[PDB]
Amino acid sequence: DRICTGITSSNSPHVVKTATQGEVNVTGVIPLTTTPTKSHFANLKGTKTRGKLCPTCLNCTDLDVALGRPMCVGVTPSAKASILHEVRPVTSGCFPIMHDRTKIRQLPNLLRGYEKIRLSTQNVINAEKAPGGPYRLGTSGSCPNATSRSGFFATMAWAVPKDNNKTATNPLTVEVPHICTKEEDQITVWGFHSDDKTQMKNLYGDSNPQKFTSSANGVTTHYVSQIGGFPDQTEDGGLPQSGRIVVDYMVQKPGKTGTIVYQRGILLPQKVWCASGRSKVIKGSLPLIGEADCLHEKYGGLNKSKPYYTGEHAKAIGNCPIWVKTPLKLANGTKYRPPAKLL
Amino acid sequence: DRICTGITSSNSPHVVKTATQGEVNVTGVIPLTTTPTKSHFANLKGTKTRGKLCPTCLNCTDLDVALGRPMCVGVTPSAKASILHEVRPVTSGCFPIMHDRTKIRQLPNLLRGYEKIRLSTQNVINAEKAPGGPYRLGTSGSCPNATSRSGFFATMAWAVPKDNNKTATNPLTVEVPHICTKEEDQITVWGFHSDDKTQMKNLYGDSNPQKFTSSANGVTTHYVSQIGGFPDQTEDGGLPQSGRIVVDYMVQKPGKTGTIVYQRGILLPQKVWCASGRSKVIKGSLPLIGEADCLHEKYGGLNKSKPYYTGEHAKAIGNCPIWVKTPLKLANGTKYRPPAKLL
Amino acid sequence: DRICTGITSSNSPHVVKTATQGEVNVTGVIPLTTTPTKSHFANLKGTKTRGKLCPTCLNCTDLDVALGRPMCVGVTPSAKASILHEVRPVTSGCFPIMHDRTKIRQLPNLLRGYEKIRLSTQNVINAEKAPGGPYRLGTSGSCPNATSRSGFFATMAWAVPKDNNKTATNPLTVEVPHICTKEEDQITVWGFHSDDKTQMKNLYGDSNPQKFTSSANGVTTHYVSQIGGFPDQTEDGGLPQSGRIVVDYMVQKPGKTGTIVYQRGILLPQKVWCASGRSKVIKGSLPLIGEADCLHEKYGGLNKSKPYYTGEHAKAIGNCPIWVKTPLKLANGTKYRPPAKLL
Amino acid sequence: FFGAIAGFLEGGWEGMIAGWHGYTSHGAHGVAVAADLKSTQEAINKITKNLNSLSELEVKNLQRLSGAMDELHNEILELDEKVDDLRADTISSQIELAVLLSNEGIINSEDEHLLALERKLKKMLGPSAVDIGNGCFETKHKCNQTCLDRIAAGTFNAGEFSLPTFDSLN
Amino acid sequence: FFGAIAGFLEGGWEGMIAGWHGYTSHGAHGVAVAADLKSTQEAINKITKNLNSLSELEVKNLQRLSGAMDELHNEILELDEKVDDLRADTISSQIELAVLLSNEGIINSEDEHLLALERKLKKMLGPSAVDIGNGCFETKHKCNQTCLDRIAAGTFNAGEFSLPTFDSLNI
Amino acid sequence: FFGAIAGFLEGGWEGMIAGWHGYTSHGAHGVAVAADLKSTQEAINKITKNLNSLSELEVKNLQRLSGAMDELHNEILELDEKVDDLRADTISSQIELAVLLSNEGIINSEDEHLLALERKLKKMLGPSAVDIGNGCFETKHKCNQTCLDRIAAGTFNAGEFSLPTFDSLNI
Ligand SMILES: *[C@@H]1O[C@H](CO)[C@@H](O[C@@H]2O[C@H](CO)[C@@H](O)[C@H](O)[C@H]2NC(C)=O)[C@H](O)[C@H]1NC(C)=O
Ligand SMILES: *[C@@H]1O[C@H](CO)[C@@H](O[C@@H]2O[C@H](CO)[C@@H](O)[C@H](O)[C@H]2NC(C)=O)[C@H](O)[C@H]1NC(C)=O
Ligand SMILES: *[C@@H]1O[C@H](CO)[C@@H](O[C@@H]2O[C@H](CO)[C@@H](O)[C@H](O)[C@H]2NC(C)=O)[C@H](O)[C@H]1NC(C)=O
Ligand SMILES: *[C@@H]1O[C@H](CO)[C@@H](O[C@@H]2O[C@H](CO)[C@@H](O)[C@H](O)[C@H]2NC(C)=O)[C@H](O)[C@H]1NC(C)=O
Ligand SMILES: *[C@@H]1O[C@H](CO)[C@@H](O[C@@H]2O[C@H](CO)[C@@H](O)[C@H](O)[C@H]2NC(C)=O)[C@H](O)[C@H]1NC(C)=O
Ligand SMILES: *[C@@H]1O[C@H](CO)[C@@H](O[C@@H]2O[C@H](CO)[C@@H](O)[C@H](O)[C@H]2NC(C)=O)[C@H](O)[C@H]1NC(C)=O
Ligand SMILES: *[C@@H]1O[C@H](CO)[C@@H](O[C@@H]2O[C@H](CO)[C@@H](O)[C@H](O)[C@H]2NC(C)=O)[C@H](O)[C@H]1NC(C)=O
Ligand SMILES: *[C@@H]1O[C@H](CO)[C@@H](O[C@@H]2O[C@H](CO)[C@@H](O)[C@H](O)[C@H]2NC(C)=O)[C@H](O)[C@H]1NC(C)=O
Ligand SMILES: *[C@@H]1O[C@H](CO)[C@@H](O[C@@H]2O[C@H](CO)[C@@H](O)[C@H](O)[C@H]2NC(C)=O)[C@H](O)[C@H]1NC(C)=O
Ligand SMILES: *[C@@H]1O[C@H](CO)[C@@H](O)[C@H](O)[C@H]1NC(C)=O
Ligand SMILES: *[C@@H]1O[C@H](CO)[C@@H](O)[C@H](O)[C@H]1NC(C)=O
Ligand SMILES: *[C@@H]1O[C@H](CO)[C@@H](O)[C@H](O)[C@H]1NC(C)=O
Ligand SMILES: *[C@@H]1O[C@H](CO)[C@@H](O)[C@H](O)[C@H]1NC(C)=O
Ligand SMILES: *[C@@H]1O[C@H](CO)[C@@H](O)[C@H](O)[C@H]1NC(C)=O
Ligand SMILES: *[C@@H]1O[C@H](CO)[C@@H](O)[C@H](O)[C@H]1NC(C)=O
Ligand SMILES: *[C@@H]1O[C@H](CO)[C@@H](O)[C@H](O)[C@H]1NC(C)=O
Ligand SMILES: *[C@@H]1O[C@H](CO)[C@@H](O)[C@H](O)[C@H]1NC(C)=O
Ligand SMILES: *[C@@H]1O[C@H](CO)[C@@H](O)[C@H](O)[C@H]1NC(C)=O
Ligand SMILES: *[C@@H]1O[C@H](CO)[C@@H](O)[C@H](O)[C@H]1NC(C)=O
Ligand SMILES: *[C@@H]1O[C@H](CO)[C@@H](O)[C@H](O)[C@H]1NC(C)=O
Ligand SMILES: *[C@@H]1O[C@H](CO)[C@@H](O)[C@H](O)[C@H]1NC(C)=O
Numbered sequence A, B, C: 001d002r003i004c005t006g007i008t009s010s011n012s013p014h015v016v017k018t019a020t021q022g023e024v025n026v027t028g029v030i031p032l033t034t035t036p037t038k039s040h041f042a043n044l045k046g047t048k049t050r051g052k053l054c055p056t057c058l059n060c061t062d063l064d065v066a067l068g069r070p071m072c073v074g075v076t077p078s079a080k081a082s083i084l085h086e087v088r089p090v091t092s093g094c095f096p097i098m099h100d101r102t103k104i105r106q107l108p109n110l111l112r113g114y115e116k117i118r119l120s121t122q123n124v125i126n127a128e129k130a131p132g133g134p135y136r137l138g139t140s141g142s143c144p145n146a147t148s149r150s151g152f153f154a155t156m157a158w159a160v161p162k163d164n165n166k167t168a169t170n171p172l173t174v175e176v177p178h179i180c181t182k183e184e185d186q187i188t189v190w191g192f193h194s195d196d197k198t199q200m201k202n203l204y205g206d207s208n209p210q211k212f213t214s215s216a217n218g219v220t221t222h223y224v225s226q227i228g229g230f231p232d233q234t235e236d237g238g239l240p241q242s243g244r245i246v247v248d249y250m251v252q253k254p255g256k257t258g259t260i261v262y263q264r265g266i267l268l269p270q271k272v273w274c275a276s277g278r279s280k281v282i283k284g285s286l287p288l289i290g291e292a293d294c295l296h297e298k299y300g301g302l303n304k305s306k307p308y309y310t311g312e313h314a315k316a317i318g319n320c321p322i323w324v325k326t327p328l329k330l331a332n333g334t335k336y337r338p339p340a341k342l343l
Numbered sequence D: 001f002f003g004a005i006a007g008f009l010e011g012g013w014e015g016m017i018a019g020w021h022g023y024t025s026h027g028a029h030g031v032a033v034a035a036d037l038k039s040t041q042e043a044i045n046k047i048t049k050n051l052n053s054l055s056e057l058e059v060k061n062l063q064r065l066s067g068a069m070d071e072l073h074n075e076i077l078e079l080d081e082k083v084d085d086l087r088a089d090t091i092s093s094q095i096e097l098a099v100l101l102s103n104e105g106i107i108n109s110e111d112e113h114l115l116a117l118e119r120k121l122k123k124m125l126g127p128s129a130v131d132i133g134n135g136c137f138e139t140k141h142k143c144n145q146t147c148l149d150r151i152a153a154g155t156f157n158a159g160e161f162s163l164p165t166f167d168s169l170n
Numbered sequence E, F: 001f002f003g004a005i006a007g008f009l010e011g012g013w014e015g016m017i018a019g020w021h022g023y024t025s026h027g028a029h030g031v032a033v034a035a036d037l038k039s040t041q042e043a044i045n046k047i048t049k050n051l052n053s054l055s056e057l058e059v060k061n062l063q064r065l066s067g068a069m070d071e072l073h074n075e076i077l078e079l080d081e082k083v084d085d086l087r088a089d090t091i092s093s094q095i096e097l098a099v100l101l102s103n104e105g106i107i108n109s110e111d112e113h114l115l116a117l118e119r120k121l122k123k124m125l126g127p128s129a130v131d132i133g134n135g136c137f138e139t140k141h142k143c144n145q146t147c148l149d150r151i152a153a154g155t156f157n158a159g160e161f162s163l164p165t166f167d168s169l170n171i
Helices: A062-067 A104-111 A197-204 B062-067 B104-111 B197-204 C062-067 C104-111 C197-204 D002-006 D037-055 D074-125 D145-152 E002-006 E037-055 E074-108 E110-125 E145-152 F002-006 F037-055 F074-125 F145-152
Strands: A002-007 A014-017 A023-026 A029-031 A081-084 A116-119 A135-138 A156-161 A172-176 A185-194 A211-216 A219-224 A244-252 A258-262 A266-269 A273-276 A280-283 A294-296 A300-302 A316-318 A329-331 B002-007 B014-017 B023-026 B029-031 B081-084 B116-119 B135-138 B156-161 B172-176 B185-194 B211-216 B219-224 B244-252 B258-262 B266-269 B273-276 B280-283 B294-296 B300-302 B316-318 B329-331 C002-007 C014-017 C023-026 C029-031 C081-084 C116-119 C135-138 C156-161 C172-176 C185-194 C211-216 C219-224 C244-252 C258-262 C266-269 C273-276 C280-283 C294-296 C300-302 C316-318 C329-331 D021-026 D032-035 D136-138 E021-026 E032-035 E136-138 F021-026 F032-035 F136-138
Touching (some): A014 D074, A062 A104, A104 A185, A104 A244, A185 A211, A211 A244, A219 B211, A219 B219, A219 C219, A258 A266, A329 D037, B002 E110, B014 B329, B062 B104, B104 B185, B156 B197, B211 B244, B219 C211, B219 C219, B244 B258, B280 B316, C014 C329, C014 F074, C104 C185, C104 C244, C156 C197, C185 C258, C280 C316, D002 D074, D021 D074, D021 D145, D032 D145, D074 D136, D074 E074, D074 F002, E002 E110, E002 F074, E021 E037, E037 E074, E074 E110, F002 F074, F021 F037, F021 F145, F037 F074, F074 F136
Parallel strands (some): A081 A280, C081 C280
Antiparallel strands (some): A002 D021, A014 A023, A029 A329, A135 A156, A156 A266, A211 A219, A294 A316, B002 E021, B029 B329, B172 B258, B185 B244, B185 B273, B211 B219, B294 B300, C002 F136, C014 C023, C135 C156, C156 C266, C185 C244, C185 C273, C211 C219, C294 C316, D021 D032, F021 F032
C-alpha cells in the first residue's frame, strides 16, 4: 500500500494577505479588530474622571465656578482625566458680561487641563487701598448670596472711587504677585465695568471711554471701553442692568509677576486660581454613566476586547484598542485546497 | 552517472541588503525608487486646482482680489487643492497701503486654505449711519471702475464726517456680526486712513494721531496712526497721493461677534469673506500646465511610476510616491555564485 | 552503532521574546541597550558647541551681551549646536530693568537658536535727529565703561529732549529698516525709560504715563508706562536710581520694516542683531567638560556604545543611541534544552 | 511553493476533520484519511503565541493639548490634529506590517508541517518501506483505517506485520 | 547557510540560462545543465507578489497648514517642519525594514528551491537511484543532455533504461 | 516545532562544549558527543550580521525649536513635547518589532541547522548506513569518541571500516 502526508480541505471563506502569495483563502481566522458602537461616556477605570469643576455646586455652570460667582463657590476635586463638554462655556447668573469681547469663556476649559485646581484663600490685591484713591468694593443684587441679596464675583473687586468729586484719572499700574506655590501656575482673573454716560459720571467722575492693558509672561492685551448702547443682557442673573462688564484672565507661571494698567471702572483681581499638574482631556458628553476601560471622542465609553479597532479615529484615553485602517485578521487554519478525488 | 540539483551563475552587479547575510550581490533587481526631475507644476488629477483666487479677473493680483479692488471683483471658484505662488502677495492698483505695518499681505493666502470662498452680497455694517456722526463714503480716482473714474475697495467704506464743523472724537465701538452660515468662517476686512496735518484737519477735524483697536476670537490688536512723512507709494494705482491707508483683517468663527474701536479716519467693513472647508495647499509656481498625478514642492508636477522616490523631500499632494532615504531594490534573481568547473 | 544530530545544553538564564514561541530561555545574548548615568555636559564631537554667547566677555551674562551692556561687547562666535543653561537669563549690571513686564529675558535664548549671530556695526536709526525735537543721548554711571565712568546699552539710545521748555508729545512713528543681509534676520532691541514725577518733569516735560506700541511681522505690542512707585532695583549696576526702563525686542524677517510709535522716554534702537542659520539647541548645564559623541538633556555628555538605550527619554543631539522602552537583547546561543541522559 | 515543485499533492482531504494536517493511505482498501493531532496542536499554539505577541503592543494615548484653547489657538489645534492623524496612519501601517508577516509565517509553515510529518512517518513505517520523495511511502503491507489510526497516534508497529523496525533509545 | 553545512555545491552553472535553478548530470559524458522552469517561475511569482505588497502601502500626504500664515506664525511653521521631517524619516525607516525582510526572504528561499528540486528528482529517478545527501543522486544509467532535458520537463522515465519506477496516483 | 513533530530529541547534551550543534553516537561504547564547528560558525555569523543590521538604523535627533521661547510660547512647546514623545514611542515600537523578528529567526533556524547536519552526516556515513528519519542513522560499525571526532571534521571515511563510500566530484 501507499501512505502519504496530507492537509485537510474545508470551507474557506476567510481571506488574509501574505507577502509572497498575495491574498489567500483560509479555513479560519481570528479577527483582530471590531468597529465600536456609540455609547454614552463614563468614568475611566483606574482614573478619577472630572466633569463639572465643582460638582457640589448645584445649578452652577463651569464658567460660573471659574469666575467665583456667589453661591457657586465650592470644592474643585483633583482629577488626572477630564471631559470637555462645553466648547463655549456659558454663564447662568450674576452681572451681564460681554463674553465674546475677550477670551474669558475658555477659562474653565483651561482649568480642567490641570490636575489640581484650587481657589486661593487670600486676596492677591487689596482693592480698597489700591492705586487711585480709596475704593468701595461694588456690589449688585444680580449676584445674590444665600445670606445676602447682593454680592459680586469672589475673584474680582468692583473698585469704585469712594470720595466726593471723583474725577478722571491717568492710567495706573498694579503689579499682580504670584501667591501660589513654586509648583503651581496662577490664573488671575480681572476686568472692567462700564455703563451709560450719566451713571459713568455718578460712579467714576468721567464719562469718556476708559483704557486697560494687561501684561503677563510676555503677552500684552489692550482694551478700550464702551459708553452706553450695549448689546442685550444674556447669560446673567435675570435682573435688568444699565451697564456691562468685560472680564479677562492672565496666566502667571510660578515666580512671574504680572501687571495691569487701568483707569476708571476697574475690576481688580482678588481670589486667584492655583493650578498644578496635567489631566488628559477629551471632548465629551455629560452625565458620566458607569465605568469603562477607554474613553473615545466618537464612540463614548468602551471596554477593550480585541487589540485593534476600525471606524472613526479620534482622541481617546485609557486602556484603549489601537486604530487600524482595515479589519485585520490572523490566520487560524489552512490555505484553501480543492477536494481531491480518485477518478 | 551522477545527477544533482543546482543554481545558475550569471553576472551579478546588483546589490541588496539582507538581515542574516549582510549585503549580497545578485543577478537582477527590481528598482523600487526613482529620483524625479524638476518639472513645471500642473493640475491635480481628480481634484480641481486653484491658482489665482479669481481667474476671470484679469490684470488683478490675489491681494487685489482679496481686498475687493474695483474692476477686480468676480467669481472665486471652490477648490480642494491650492498652489501658493506668492509668499508676499503684492497689490497692483488702487489706494496706497502701508502693507508691512500689518498682516494684510497674508490675507489671500489665508483664503486659499479654505475650500469655498465667496464675497458677501450685503454689507455687514451701515457705514453712513455708523457711530460718530453721519459719514459720507469717501472715494478716489486711484481706484477707478470701468464705468467710473473713482471708487474704493468693496470690502471697506471710507467713513468721512459729512457735516461742517466736524470735530475730534472719543474711541467708538462697533460690533461686527457674523453674517455667514453656521458652516462658514467670516473674514472681516477693516482699516484706517491717514494724511498730512492740513488734510487731516479738512477731512476729520483733528490733526492728532488716531487710535484703533480690534478684538475678535480672543485676539486684540492695537494701532496708532501717523500724520504726514509717509513712506513712498508703491503697489498702488499710479496716482500721487498725500495720504496712506493701513489695512487689516479679523477672523470671526461662526456665531462669534467681533468688535472695532476707532476714531477718525476709519475704514469700516462692508462686504466680508465667507469661507468654508479646507483645501490642501502647497507652495508652487504659476502657470499650471497639463495634468499630473502628484504635486511636489521641489520637483513640480509628476506622475507616479515606482512606489517610492529618492531626492529632496518636501510637501506633496495627490497620488504620490513615498520618500525613502536610499534607492531601494527588490531582488529578482539569485545570489552570486562563482562559475563551477570540471578539472 | 547509532549516530544522531544534536544541540547543546548549558545554563540558559537569558530570556528573549519570539513571535511563534513566546518568551524563550537562551544560553547567550548580546545586549542591545544600556542605561546611561548622569554625567557632566561636554562638547559635541564634530560640532563646535556654544555656551555663553560671547565667551571672551568675562563677568558678563548672556542677557548683558544680548542687550549690549558696556564692557560686555565682544565677539559672538558661530555654532551649529547650543546649550540652553538659563531658562530665565538674568542681568549683572547697568540700568535697572523691570524684566518680567516683557519677553526680554528670552532674547539671548532666541539668539542662540541661530547659527551665526553678529551685532551690527552701524546704527539702524539716527537717534539725535529722530522725531520729537532733537535729542541728547542719555547716559548713566550705572553703566560704567573701562575707559569711562558712564555709558549705556549699545543697542539703544536714551532719547531725551535737548531744548529748554521741553513738552509732552503726540505719539510719533519711526520706521525701523532691515539693515542685515538678505540671508539674515534682524532682531531690533528697543524700550522706554520712566521715572518719578519730578524727574519726569525735568527730563521730558511731562509727568503723565507715556504710551508705546511696536509693530513688526504682524505682531503688535502695546505698553503704557509707570510713574514712580517702582519695584526695587535688581540685577543692575548696584547704583541707586529713581527710575526704571522696560525693554523689548522685535524680530524682522529680511526685507521687512518695523515701526515703533512712542512718546516721552523712548529708548530708540541703535545696534541691531543680525542672525542667520539654525543651531541645534538643547537644555544643559555649564561648564562644558571634554568631548562626547552625544548630548542628552537628562544624562549630559555621553559616548555611543550599544545602538539603543533605556532610561529617561529627552531631547538629545549628535551621534546618539536610540531610546527604547525595554532592555532588548539579540539572541547569541541556543534555546534551553534539559540535559539528556542514557538510562 | 515547496510542494508545487516537489510534486506534493495540491488537493486536500475533506475527511480530515480532527485536524489540519495528517496522513492518507492508498492501495486496495481505497483511501483512508487521518488527522495528526501533534502537528495541528503545534500550529494552533504557534498562532496563539503570535496572537499574544500582536496583542502585546501598547501605544501612547492621543488626547487634547491642555494649554491650547479653542478659537484663541486654532493654528496650534490644526497642527495638533495633523499630528494625531499622522500618528494613527503610521502606527496603522506598522500594525498591518506585523500582521502581514505573521500570516506569511503561517501559510509558509504549512509545508514544513508536512515535511515533519514525513519524518515521523518514515521512522514509524520502518526500513522496509520505500521513500518516493513526494511525501509518499510504498509499503509491503496493507494499511486500512485502523492502521492509519495507529500511525496517527504513534502506536504503529511494523512488527505487527512481521517487518523490521527502528528501535528507540532509552 | 543550509547548503554550506550540508555540503551542497557552493558554485553555479553558467549554462543554466533558461532559469535560476535546475539540474546537472555528471559522469562520463562530461557535464550537462538544465534549468527547471517550474521552480524558476515559482520564484518569479513570489517576488512579483512581494512587489505588489510593497507597492500597496499608502500613506497620508504632507501639505501646508491652512491656518498658519508665514511671518505671523513662524514658530508653528517650524514645529510643522519638524513634524514633516520626522514623519518622512520614520516612514522611510519602516519601508527600509519591509524591503529588508522581503530581500532576506528572497535570498533565503534558494536552498529551499534546491531541496524541493531534490524531491522532484528523487521521485522521477525511481527507487534504483541512490541518495547521497548533498543534493546528488547516483544512477545506474547514463544521462546526457537529452536525458537531463527530459528530467527538467518531468517526462523522464526510468523504464526507458529498463529500471524500476514509482507510479503516480490518479488524482 | 519541526523536531517536535518529527520526533527529534527534545533534550540536549552538556558535553557539547565547543559549539551549539553537532552529533552524538550511541550503541555499546555508550554515548559520545561532538560539536560541529561549521554549523556553529554559520549561526554566529548570521547573528553577527543581524546585529550589524540592527545597529545600522539611523534616526533624526530631537532638539528644541529655535524660534519658540519659554513662557511666551507654552502651547507650542506643549505640542512639541507631544511630538517628541510620540516619535520616541513609535520608533521604540518599530525597533522592538525588528528585534522580535530577528530573535524569531534565530530560534526558528535551530532545526534547520539540524536538518543540514543530517545531510552532511548522510553523505559522510556512506550508502551502507540506514536513515531512520528522526535525525538518526544506524551503522554497521562501532563509533567511539575518536570516530565521532572524525565525523565532526569531515575526515570520516567508511573505507576504514571496509564499507562503501560516496566519492566526491572534482570541482
Ligand atoms: C474565497 O474568498 C471569496 C471571498 O470571501 C469567496 O467568494 C465570495 O463568496 C461567494 C462566492 O462563493 C459570493 O457570494 C461572494 O460575493 C464572494 N465574494 C467575493 C469578494 O468574491 C469564496 O467563496 C472563497 N472560497 C473559494 C473556494 O474561492
Ligand atoms: C465595562 O465593563 C464594566 C465592568 O464589567 C461594566 O460595568 C459593570 O457591570 C455591571 C453593569 O451592568 C454592573 O453590575 C457592575 O457593577 C459594573 N462594574 C463597575 C461599574 O465597576 C460596564 O458596563 C462595561 N461598559 C461597557 C461594556 O461599555
Ligand atoms: C484556532 O482554530 C482552531 C480550530 O481548529 C481552534 O481550536 C478549536 O477549538 C477546540 C476547543 O474546544 C479545539 O479543541 C479544537 O482543536 C478546535 N475545534 C475544532 C472543531 O476543530 C482554536 O481555538 C482557534 N484559536 C482561537 C479561536 O483563538
Ligand atoms: C559585487 O557588486 C559590486 C557593486 O556593484 C561590484 O563592484 C564593482 O565592480 C566593478 C568591476 O568589477 C567596478 O568597476 C566597480 O567600481 C565596483 N564597485 C561598485 C560598482 O561600487 C562587484 O563587481 C560585484 N561582484 C561580482 C559581480 O562578483
Ligand atoms: C502625466 O500623465 C498625463 C496623462 O497621460 C500626461 O498628459 C497626457 O499626455 C499628452 C501630453 O500632453 C496629451 O496628449 C494627453 O492628452 C494628456 N492627457 C491628459 C489627461 O492630460 C502628462 O504629460 C504626464 N505628466 C508628466 C509625465 O510629467
Ligand atoms: C524578474 O526576472 C525575470 C527573469 O529573470 C523576468 O522575466 C522575464 O520576462 C520574460 C517574458 O517574455 C520571461 O519569459 C523570462 O522569465 C524573462 N525574460 C527576459 C528576457 O527578461 C521578470 O519580468 C522580472 N520581474 C520584473 C521585471 O518585475
Ligand atoms: C529561565 O529564565 C529564568 C529567568 O532568567 C530563570 O529563572 C530565574 O532564576 C532565579 C535564580 O535565583 C530565580 O529568581 C527564578 O528561578 C528566576 N527568576 C525570575 C525573576 O523568575 C530560569 O532558571 C531559566 N530556566 C532554565 C535556566 O532552565
Ligand atoms: C568620550 O570619548 C572621548 C574620546 O575618547 C573621551 O575623551 C578622551 O579620553 C581622555 C579623557 O578621558 C583624553 O586623554 C583624550 O584626549 C580624550 N579625547 C578627546 C578627543 O578629547 C571622553 O572622556 C569620553 N566621554 C565619556 C566616556 O563620557
Ligand atoms: C556569540 O557567542 C560566541 C560563542 O557562543 C562568541 O564567540 C566566542 O568567544 C570569543 C569571541 O570571539 C572567541 O574567542 C571564541 O572562540 C568564540 N567561540 C566560538 C566562536 O565558538 C561571540 O563572541 C558571541 N558574539 C557576541 C558576543 O557578539
Ligand atoms: C435650582 O435647582 C432646583 C433643583 O434642581 C430647581 O428647582 C431650581 O429651578 C433651580 N434654580 C434655577 C435654575 O434658577
Ligand atoms: C454671602 O456674601 C457675603 C458678601 O456678599 C459674604 O461675606 C458671605 O460670606 C457669603 N456667605 C456665604 C458664601 O455663605
Ligand atoms: C473738584 O472738581 C473739579 C474738577 O473735577 C474742580 O473744582 C476741583 O479740581 C476738584 N477738586 C478735587 C478733585 O479735590
Ligand atoms: C491689462 O493692462 C494693460 C496695461 O496697458 C492693458 O494693455 C490690457 O488691455 C489690460 N487687460 C485688460 C484690461 O483686460
Ligand atoms: C462701477 O462704478 C462704481 C465704482 O465706485 C460702483 O458702483 C461699482 O464698482 C460699479 N457700478 C455699478 C456696478 O453699478
Ligand atoms: C460747532 O462748534 C464746534 C467746533 O467744531 C463743534 O464741535 C460743534 O459740534 C458745533 N456746534 C453745534 C451746535 O453743532
Ligand atoms: C570680574 O569680577 C572679579 C571680582 O568681582 C574681578 O576679580 C575680575 O577682575 C572681574 N573681571 C572683569 C571686571 O573683567
Ligand atoms: C567706553 O564707552 C564710550 C561711550 O561712553 C565709548 O565711546 C568707548 O569707545 C568705550 N570704550 C571701550 C574700550 O569700550
Ligand atoms: C514754551 O512753553 C510754552 C508753555 O509750556 C509752550 O506753549 C511753547 O510752545 C513753548 N515754546 C517752545 C517749546 O519753543
Ligand atoms: C483492518 O484489517 C485488520 C486485519 O484483518 C482487521 O482486524 C481490522 O478490523 C481492519 N479494520 C478495518 C477498519 O477494516
Ligand atoms: C543521448 O544518448 C541517446 C542514446 O544513445 C541518444 O539517442 C541521444 O541522441 C543522446 N543525446 C545527445 C544530446 O547526445
Ligand atoms: C576507538 O576504537 C579504536 C579501535 O581500534 C581505537 O583505536 C581508538 O583509540 C578508540 N578511541 C577511543 C577514544 O577509545
